[PDB]
Amino acid sequence: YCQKWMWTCDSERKCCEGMVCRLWCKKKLW
Amino acid sequence: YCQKWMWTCDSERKCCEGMVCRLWCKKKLW
Amino acid sequence: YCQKWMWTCDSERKCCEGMVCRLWCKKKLW
Amino acid sequence: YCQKWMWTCDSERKCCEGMVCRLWCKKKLW
Amino acid sequence: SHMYLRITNIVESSFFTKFIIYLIVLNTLFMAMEHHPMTEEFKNVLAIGNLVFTGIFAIEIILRIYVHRISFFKDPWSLFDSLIVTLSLVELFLADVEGLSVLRSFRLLRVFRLVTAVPQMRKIVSALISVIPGMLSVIALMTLFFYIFAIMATQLFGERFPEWFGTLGESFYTLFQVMTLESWSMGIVRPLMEVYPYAWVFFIPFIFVVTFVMINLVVAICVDA
Amino acid sequence: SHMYLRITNIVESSFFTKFIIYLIVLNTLFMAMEHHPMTEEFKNVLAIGNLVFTGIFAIEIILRIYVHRISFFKDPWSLFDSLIVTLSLVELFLADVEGLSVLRSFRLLRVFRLVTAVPQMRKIVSALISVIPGMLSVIALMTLFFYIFAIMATQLFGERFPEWFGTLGESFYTLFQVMTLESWSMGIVRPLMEVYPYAWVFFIPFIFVVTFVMINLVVAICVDA
Amino acid sequence: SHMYLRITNIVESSFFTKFIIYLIVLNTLFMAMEHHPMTEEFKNVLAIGNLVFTGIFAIEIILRIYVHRISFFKDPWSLFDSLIVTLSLVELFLADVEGLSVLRSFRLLRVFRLVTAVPQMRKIVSALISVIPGMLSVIALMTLFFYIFAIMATQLFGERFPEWFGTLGESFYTLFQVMTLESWSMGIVRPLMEVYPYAWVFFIPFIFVVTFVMINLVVAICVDA
Amino acid sequence: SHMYLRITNIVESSFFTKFIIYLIVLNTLFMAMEHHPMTEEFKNVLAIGNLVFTGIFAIEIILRIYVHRISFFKDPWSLFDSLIVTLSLVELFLADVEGLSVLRSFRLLRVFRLVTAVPQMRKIVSALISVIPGMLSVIALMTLFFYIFAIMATQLFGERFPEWFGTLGESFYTLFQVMTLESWSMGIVRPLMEVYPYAWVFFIPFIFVVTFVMINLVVAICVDAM
Structure with missing residues (x-):
């Protein structure tokens, strides 16, 4: 599926909508 | 006629002899 | 002849041997 | 042959193995 | 408990x-x-x-x-x-x-x-921050001088040389620079003089003032000791 | 009324x-x-x-x-x-x-x-303007030193380097510049030395004098208060 | 014997x-x-x-x-x-x-x-070295400021300006340079601002701080004797 | 008469x-x-x-x-x-x-x-010349420091950079320059570092020492004042 908030992420396991990958999925400024 | 010292001025109401328009008419010398 | 020591000198009235013109004839530090 | 440690040296009289010529033969890293 | x-x-x-x-x-x-x-x-x-x-x-x-x-x-x-x-x-x-x-x-x-x-760092820094208010008066005065001289210059030297004086901000920056005596003649004043000849009368008094004020600051420190 | x-x-x-x-x-x-x-x-x-x-x-x-x-x-x-x-x-x-x-x-x-x-600004500035006269004598001395050294230089370095020393005025400016230690070697002295080799003997004492005198000035301030 | x-x-x-x-x-x-x-x-x-x-x-x-x-x-x-x-x-x-x-x-x-x-040199140098311990505290404080600010800068201005801030070393060197007010605007800060606009907020406080602290150091001497 | x-x-x-x-x-x-x-x-x-x-x-x-x-x-x-x-x-x-x-x-x-x-000029300048001897000792110490550091540098940076350090003279001049904090990094130290990387270790202590000593000199003037 996609990697939820604070779960690990990489080039193949991307973050769910509204997040950005920085080793783990972080939230994008509101 | 013409706009005397310190009278408002524009494209149709010009300053009298010896003056210059800068929104209002200024004198070039004493 | 020539202009001796301390005599006025110019383009036509040159200083005698061993001197240099600086309005008047000066010595060339021997 | 060759010039040993602290013997004079020059273009024709070189230092023995492990030394370098600086007017006299010095030791390079023991 | x-x-x-x-x-x-x-x-x-x-x-x-x-x-x-x-x-x-x-x-x-x-x-x-x-x-x-x-x-x-x-x-x-x-x-x-x-x-x-x-x-x-x-x-x-x-x-x-x-x-x-x-x-x-x-x-x-x-x-x-x-x-x-x-x-x-x-x-x-x-x-x-x-x-x-x-x-x-x-x-x-x-x-x-x-x-x-x-x-130790906490205490020493606390000492120095306790020192500064005694000179907050001079800090505020010097900042006001910067404000005034900055507006004047930027309104003067804005036509050409906008990078240094185009607005009040670059003017503040460049005036602080001048105060530091860092490339104040070769890179700033002299190019300005090339167009505005009498700009020198502006900066030289300025220098005086700030350097003078800064020495006063040290004097104030020599007062606290 | x-x-x-x-x-x-x-x-x-x-x-x-x-x-x-x-x-x-x-x-x-x-x-x-x-x-x-x-x-x-x-x-x-x-x-x-x-x-x-x-x-x-x-x-x-x-x-x-x-x-x-x-x-x-x-x-x-x-x-x-x-x-x-x-x-x-x-x-x-x-x-x-x-x-x-x-x-x-x-x-x-x-x-x-x-x-x-x-x-408040009035009173503070009045304090500093009251300070300046006590050293106005040294200010005048340093200005006289500037005048003398400036005439000297301009008459020396006027021919080859008129842009910096062509007359007494540019010489006053450049000497004041030197006083601040702003590009005094790379932009001024060394280009001069390239033609006049012994120009160094000129400026290094000058620096000393003015710089040391300025220190005396600040010390004079520490004397006054 | x-x-x-x-x-x-x-x-x-x-x-x-x-x-x-x-x-x-x-x-x-x-x-x-x-x-x-x-x-x-x-x-x-x-x-x-x-x-x-x-x-x-x-x-x-x-x-x-x-x-x-x-x-x-x-x-x-x-x-x-x-x-x-x-x-x-x-x-x-x-x-x-x-x-x-x-x-x-x-x-x-x-x-x-x-x-x-x-x-004579031995004794004079011994007096000058005897002065230092009274200021070792301020020496260490200023060195710590250098260390922290160097880390900070190198991580900020490190990417585009490796020549000046690529690592901790070049950044330490560059910050020491800035302390001296040597081409700090024309050669360093102003080129930086072209890419990182708000770099001024970095150096101007730093200038203050370190230079201000340096005054304290000299002041310590004026207090040490 | x-x-x-x-x-x-x-x-x-x-x-x-x-x-x-x-x-x-x-x-x-x-x-x-x-x-x-x-x-x-x-x-x-x-x-x-x-x-x-x-x-x-x-x-x-x-x-x-x-x-x-x-x-x-x-x-x-x-x-x-x-x-x-x-x-x-x-x-x-x-x-x-x-x-x-x-x-x-x-x-x-x-x-x-x-x-x-x-x-009046005579009296003021006489005051200054009366001040100098009290610090001539430090003047001489600093001059000796200049001499020593100049010898060292000229022998180091003489090969690649004769224009600044070719001899003891250019070295004395350049060291006084560095003391003044005038284009000491951009025009001097960094060009030197390009070839001799660890030259920094040389000048930064030097700066300290001389600048520090000059503070002492100024302090000596303050000593003569207070």
């Missing part, structure tokens, strides 16, 4: 403070050994290390607040430390704005603990 | 002085928000604002003169303020001729009220 | 110390008259002279050792002098391998005898 | 000293208004003016010698003034060789009377 008492003994014990200090210094060496020309798995590992240290500092500061029931907030240094650890923790799970990576700056900011968590 | 007394009460009322100060700061911020690359009709509106503030300041200063006359002229700071408002009023009625816009410079000059119309 | 007593009289006789001082000054003028754009037979002669003076200094230092025994080591200046003569002796028969000519650097080092073999 | 006494009264009269001071200032303004992009007849007249002033100053100095002999030479400021007028006179009788115009330089040097013939 038994567990609370044990926790307090732990917090105020010199051991805990020194542990945090060495942890901070280790984290500091950790981030310091950062060479941006990498983009190497090293860069990613740095984030992991920062993560752990920030978690530990959150633990520490939580203990500190629990122990210093509101009392530490009254103390500026404690509030400052709570704020720094707060910003570091926030950047940890929050993300950067795309246009500008300001939050990576908040992550790097954490390095200021070396002064607040250290008592 | 009764009417005279009412006017005087308003003039000396702290309210009136603070009103003028805030008005001045407003006019100053108004002119400050001036970006020379504007030409967007902004200039006319800015001039209009200037006009209103100047008219109001003329009102103020007329009242201020009215209350105390010879006392008002007697006070230097007061007369200074009257002169500043006067120059602004003059710029209103006269024009910049054409070659050089000096009168628009006078219009911007008006901003010194931020110090003259403020009593 | 008759021969020992004679040796001691010679070592402590003012004549012997003045002799060493004059010999050292002679050696100093000898190496001093060295211009590297030479490549003449002169270089070999310079090395020969070094050899002789160092041999004599070894003789002297052996005599000092015989005279004082462990007493010689207790005195720092004695140890310093023994160390210098030792390094010269080492360079005489050891080699700089090839990659880096460090040993000729040790050979040139020997020049500090002019202060160590001189008692 | 009668004539001796009259001449002395004139010499010490404040009027005569003020006359010389104003004459000197006039000569100073005269020489000052000199712009080398000249090559006009103006230059000739300037030289003419020089002649008169020096003759008058020669006259003045002669009179001074007449009133007091050994006392005049004993006073340094007076002897200094006599020397200045003397050098001006020398350039007056002869001129320098074409290769180098030193003698016109002595003619311009003459301008120091503005301090020597002025008593």
